[PDB]
Amino acid sequence: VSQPPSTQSTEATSGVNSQEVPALTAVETGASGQAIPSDVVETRHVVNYKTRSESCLESFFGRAACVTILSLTNSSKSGEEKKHFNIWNITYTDTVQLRRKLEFFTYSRFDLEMTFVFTENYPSTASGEVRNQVYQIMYIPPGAPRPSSWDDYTWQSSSNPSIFYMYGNAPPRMSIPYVGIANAYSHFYDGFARVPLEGENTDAGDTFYGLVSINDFGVLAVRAVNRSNPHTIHTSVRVYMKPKHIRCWCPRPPRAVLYRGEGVDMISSAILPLTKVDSITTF
Amino acid sequence: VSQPPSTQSTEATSGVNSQEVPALTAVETGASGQAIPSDVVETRHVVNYKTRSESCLESFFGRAACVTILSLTNSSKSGEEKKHFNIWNITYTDTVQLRRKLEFFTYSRFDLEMTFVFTENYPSTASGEVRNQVYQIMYIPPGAPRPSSWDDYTWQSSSNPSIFYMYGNAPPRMSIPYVGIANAYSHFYDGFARVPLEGENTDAGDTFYGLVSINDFGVLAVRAVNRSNPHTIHTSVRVYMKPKHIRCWCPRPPRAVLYRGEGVDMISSAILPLTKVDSITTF
Amino acid sequence: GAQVSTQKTGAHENQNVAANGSTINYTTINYYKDSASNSATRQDLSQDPSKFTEPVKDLMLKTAPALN
Amino acid sequence: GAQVSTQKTGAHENQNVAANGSTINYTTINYYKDSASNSATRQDLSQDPSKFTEPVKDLMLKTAPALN
Amino acid sequence: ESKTSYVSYINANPGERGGEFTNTYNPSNTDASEGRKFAALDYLLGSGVLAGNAFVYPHQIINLRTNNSATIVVPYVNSLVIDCMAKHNNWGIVILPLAPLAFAATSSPQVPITVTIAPMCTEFNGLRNITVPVHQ
Amino acid sequence: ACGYSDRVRQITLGNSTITTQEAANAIVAYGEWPTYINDSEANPVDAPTEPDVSSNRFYTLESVSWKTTSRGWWWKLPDCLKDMGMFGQNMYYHYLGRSGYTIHVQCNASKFHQGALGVFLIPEFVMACNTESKTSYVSYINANPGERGGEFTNTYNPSNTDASEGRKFAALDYLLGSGVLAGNAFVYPHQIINLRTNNSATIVVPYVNSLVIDCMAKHNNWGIVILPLAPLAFAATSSPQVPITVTIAPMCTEFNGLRNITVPVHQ
Amino acid sequence: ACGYSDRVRQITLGNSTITTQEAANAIVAYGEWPTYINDSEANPVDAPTEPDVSSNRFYTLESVSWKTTSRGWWWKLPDCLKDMGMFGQNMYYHYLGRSGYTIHVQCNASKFHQGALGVFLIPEFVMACNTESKTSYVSYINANPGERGGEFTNTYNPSNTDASEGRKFAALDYLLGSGVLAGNAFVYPHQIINLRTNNSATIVVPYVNSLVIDCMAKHNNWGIVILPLAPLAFAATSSPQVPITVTIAPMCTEFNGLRNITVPVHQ
Amino acid sequence: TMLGEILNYYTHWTGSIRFTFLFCGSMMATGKLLLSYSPPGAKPPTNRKDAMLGTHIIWDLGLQSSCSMVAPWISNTVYRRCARDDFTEGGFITCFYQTRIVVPASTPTSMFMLGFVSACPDFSVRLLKDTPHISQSKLIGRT
């Protein structure tokens, strides 16, 4: 049995008239302000039991956030074969909620919990019959051969980790180790994938700059394993990521404006975070 | 509590000027090159914690790979009775992914984990009604009587091990002991199933040569147990093999060219593994 | 191989003291061979706000002249 | 009849030392009468590269003349 | 706004000169030689984050009425122990006038700002022929 | 030592003795030496026949010739000995036979020649048939050449029609006639006879199989292959030639299941 | 020993490694090995810069060619390295520099060649100028050739008029261009590459000077000279040619007095 | 190569690579080559005076037929991607003549050397992936 650390309690204090001035400081030093109630006013004694138990990075990142929505269609019509499967690039930039949070830190390190939610429906009036669907999520790491058709040899997965879902069952989920090839996950990257030497374009680099130019986690090749039926059916698969067993370094300000692309990039369309206030003296 | 063996660490070294030349050798002996950083350059001290934990044969073969895809059709039409069931020959040569890996070793020994994935669909516009399907996988060892029709006495399985799947439920799976009648599984076999004596064809043997001519694990007789409905329904069953509790002997080079048949056999069509390189000095 | 631990004080619970009864114990038995598969790591309330609010070289104490 | 063992060091885990806490223990209870039914055999990192990289009769040591 | 993460090595790495911040954002979707450079938007650190919170970074403030120097010692920072310098810039030094320069006399005062950097605990691995990047 | 060179070496078995003043050590396959079947590993219950000296000696195969055109050679154990003295008799009179061997490949030239032979000893050396009309289509007769053994080529021309050209191995050198780059044939016990360095190759090999003892007349455990990794060369002619001789010696041979003698199909 | 031949030898510094299977031992100049400046012998008071691996490695100079006509070659340390990688940078950015080196002269032929190179390492190798109109008349440019180094001749023709031919060394071989019979150049640390015996020469040399550390950009402590004591010869042509390569490696290098970089006069 | 084929079943790799060469010329031929590994980042070594500025070894042909030159694991990331990637650059292994192969009277004037590659004991690979090196025609069926 143990007692979680509580937030500073307030010890009772009173007047003062010393040469000790906790009120004044010099933030030029780079040090934040330190004063607390006791230093400025007369306080009473207060026993604080409350804890920052929920601001613990593990709690703050303890949610299965949706990262992307993939679509695919099992159809029996002419050009509906390439539709019989889909390939998603692993990343959290597809959305903005989770992304922003992680984006609070320069580097991070964690294990990952993938959770998948499937939702199928009928497109046109082809509201007929179709047996139950069995999907396959295949993780194709960088370097592994990718599926040509919704059914070429690649879906054997003799080495690639694959899930097999039977629509209607509990949302398949699985865990992934910290796989980064670095000592930590890099969230930003003020560099280029390679060094452009003396005799090259006076623009070289514009193609390979940014974290995006060096990061690569492979892709998720989803598909329905059933064959094509009379009526066409459409499925939407949603990817959920929850970074667990985490720890991060170097805090940075939150993304204040809309996100453009995978990089920092802003759009002149929306770069006014704040809001006009009547007057500087308007409560 | 114990500590997994790590890969050689680098001990710091410096110059040299001895009659000890770790650099030179004579690979004619049949011994590979042995030198390491320390022997050639000045190294720093490096504590290696990394482990070949994932190259352990058990990890390397630790995946449920798809070995074959069987098809069958429960139809009520004239010649759709022989379609009401199917017989698959047990082996891993039906595909190439797992096969190639095992093919890394001459002999191997292991237990097997069978996993089955069923996926039914509607063929033509016979997109009508059909109750839920219940399949049966019956293992018919060498010597046991095989099914004539999708429903002759054989499907009693008073001795043959049979699974009964209720489509929509978790992918049925089961385990199998190392059943080889040898002390190990033979992956290759430079011999003939029998010895052709003095007075016989000057070609005798061409029929019974190769591992394939001696190996036999029986067959999987699959089928739907339901009777024929108005509308015809088509099912595809996929077999998955994961060799576990494994160990192998005698390493051999990997299959470099496309596979023809179950034997080594190559096809003049594709026997150029490598790729032309501009020049021997082209980085 | 199970490991018991203290729960998170709830509604009608132990005075914040989290030191009242075994009725606040939850059991845990890891089932997988890979750590990654485990639940959220135990709540850690440690913290050093100073590496951010005061990474100054020479230390200054409230009551003194920030600039001496 | 359960047997506890060490997990595979994960993300925010014990310094590689795998010697920190019981929070890295996983339990195992075989349920079937046939060994074949068991999980993957325990990770074995033993190895003897020499039966392949040096199956030479007379042993030669780096620093010496491979051909004496 | 015609491309993303579109910056040339040459422009990203100014050197002794370094860049400058502006208070306007005018992307050149056409002129591809004006796109290949940072959009140093001051009130957003050219990052898309209010500079008002740039203090969650090691920093000091040179308030003329108080000091005339700023000293910030910084340790290597990265998701790796050692990296490739010619490709990656670990740190970035930024100086923003939180308070505008001002002098009772003219309405065009000017004062020099000098930056002196000193590396420490430097170590390199992987020696070969020298690297000479693209230049103009 | 008194100058015990790693180059000089003598070998003796039965009443046979090899010698060599330029070898490059010798290798022992997978690090294990020939052994007999141990009462705990036995299978056949009849008392085995262990020939010892009568059959465990040095039998020398008809030499072949290394030409600038030579593409390679191959043989099969026990096959390429089925006719070698007493060993053969025992081999054929018994259903089951077990053995390991000491392979000694000879090939001397002169300090003015160039060349490098890769002598590999491959277990379960199965090659592809020469006919894309059938699979695993090889006749016993062709699979088991004997003292002669086969030869490798550098071309693949299957006879889908002529069924008498299909029933034979497609000895494609750059693929070991197996469908694997010869460049990695080194993951097999081996030595390299580089003329400027050595003139012999000695590879001791232990029985290898998924069984303790097997039926020799049907199965060839090992396969000996020699590929010129470096083409023969001589400053003089542009058609140099040097003999390559192969001397094999079985060891720890034992047989079970004695009956009338086996005489396979022949021409 | 396990046959630790006096002929075979390996050398390593930084990320560089020399090897040689026919050397004739190696010599250590005056019996002393490279060392650093000891607190009791120091002079400059600033903390020295000791490059270690970054500069104390094996830099290989452009090979030259040995012809039946070849008269000799020469170089100067540290000069003939002023452009060698990192070493140079340090050398030029500092007023004072100190170093010793390991010289490795290579030159293989064949058991059918003849020849003998006398590799001498001479301290303070000052040569006479080519002009009897002036004394000690040599331009910096000519005195410091670099990777190229000079060559010896067997004739002395001073240009008293043409003042651009005077400003250069009079590399008179039979007199070391010093006015001393080369026959006694052996009172200097040296080795002889006699083709029928060896193919390498290894001479480790320690810093030598009347001071602890000096200014490299002005002074060349050592001078490397190679004279064919025995003319190259080959049974075939009467114009044989063989390459001679020189690989130098500085050791225990330390510099004092750091400032802007030095860039001497050039053409 | 065997090393390659294996690496190709995994996603990441770390370690030092051992390049071993066997000169197969005539006993009578001499010569001194220069093998070199230059870690990434600069102009690829086209000439000797550039390769010599990095990790190298001057191999002297002699009784000892073979000679190894090691590629000391020098990388920024702790693991390198198996697939081709610029971030995970490897470096440049070249070769040159220190002098020149020299043969005498009646000696084959041209020959070869075999180049082998293997991994050092500090080498490890991780993240099991399928290999691209093999193909397979979508299987028939029976429909």
Ligand SMILES: CCCCCCCCCCCCCC(=O)O
């Ligand atoms: C069968 C499902 C396999 C899923 C594999 C996902 C690979 C994880 C890569 C890590 C992604 C999050 C890290 C990050 O971008 O910060």
Ligand SMILES: CCCCCCCCCCCCCC(=O)O
């Ligand atoms: C009810 C399902 C029964 C399945 C029986 C399968 C028999 C296993 C034979 C072993 C197959 C793999 C061995 C191999 O070919 O290397």
Ligand SMILES: *C(=O)CCCCCCCCCCCCC
């Ligand atoms: C420590 O683990 C001893 C207590 C065991 C109680 C049984 C828990 C139920 C089984 C755990 C999962 C085993 C999976 C093979």
Ligand SMILES: *C(=O)CCCCCCCCCCCCC
């Ligand atoms: C050793 O096994 C003692 C611990 C038992 C804990 C209970 C585990 C749950 C039951 C195991 C399966 C039994 C099947 C009949």
Ligand SMILES: [Ca+2]
């Ligand atoms: Ca408190």
Ligand SMILES: [Ca+2]
């Ligand atoms: Ca270690």
